[PDB]
Design a protein around this ligand. Structure first.
Ligand code: HEC
Ligand code: HEC
Ligand SMILES: [Ca+2]
Ligand SMILES: [Ca+2]
Ligand SMILES: [Ca+2]
Ligand SMILES: [Ca+2]
Ligand SMILES: [Ca+2]
Ligand SMILES: [Cu+2]
Lengths: 106, 106
């Protein structure tokens, strides 16, 4: 999967989580998002295409995915406890991080 | 302090950070914001007066301050490293988290 494919997985699964009727459904979507975030973290985005792979910008780009994964893991904790509303609310915290990385790098 | 007073501290100190130029000024304003956020987390906002402490809405209200405080800490670390502009950018990014809670509970 390329970066854009991973981003579609992230986008589609936020919607699945919003519509979910139990916490296990939230968990299944979060699990896919975790893999998509880690795959995306290996990519070089177009806006950084000609910069060095070791550049501060590339490390900052990659760091955004670690924080996103931390949010996914915290939502997974709640989902695995059957706490559907809380897990959905924890997943909504992802959106600002979608926005913030996009502001700088999309 | 009252929830509104804590919100005034958060609001006015964002502007202090935006207009500042040095690490000490940014750090001082972020420190005030952090304390105000921790105190705000203890309140019951007017729109949730009809709710119980373990309601999903109160869980979610408290969780937003946990999140905000974590990102204030990230901004403080940048300020402590002397990265004034990066710390100011992190402070501006807090607004998305402010807005997220407001969309539900303000
Ligand atoms: C950086 C750390 C990012 C995070 C976190 C998220 N996204 Fe992203 N996204 C990022 C880049 C660099 C790009 C541009 C890719 C390109 O090839 O131009 C994108 C793009 C998207 C897209 C559009 C995909 C496309 O066809 O270009 C979507 C729909 C998208 N991103 C969604 C999305 C969501 C929902 C996120 C949070 C859950 C999210 N992204 C995080 C970089 C980063
Ligand atoms: C929930 C987790 C919140 C976060 C994070 C932030 N705010 Fe907030 N804010 C919240 C509520 C429930 C309310 C309404 C309080 C009331 O009694 O009506 C507010 C209100 C404000 C206001 C208006 C103050 C007023 O007199 O009503 C401001 C200017 C404000 N909040 C600012 C603000 C900023 C700048 C934040 C991030 C740094 C922020 N808030 C976070 C709930 C929450
Ligand atoms: Ca493309
Ligand atoms: Ca990875
Ligand atoms: Ca090239
Ligand atoms: Ca916490
Ligand atoms: Ca570091
Ligand atoms: Cu966060």
């Amino acid at each position: 999967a390329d970066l854009e494919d991973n981003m579609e997985t992230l986008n589609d699964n936020l919607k699945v989580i919003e519509k979910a009727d139990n916490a296990a459904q939230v968990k299944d979507a979060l699990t896919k998002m975790r893999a998509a975030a880690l795959d995306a973290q290996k990519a070089t985005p177009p806006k950084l295409e000609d910069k060095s792979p070791d550049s501060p910008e590339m490390w900052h780009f990659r760091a955004g995915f670690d924080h996103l994964v931390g949010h996914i893991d915290d939502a997974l904790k709640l989902a695995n406890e059957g706490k559907v509303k809380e897990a959905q609310a924890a997943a909504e915290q992802l959106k600002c991080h979608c926005n913030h990385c996009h502001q700088h790098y999309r």
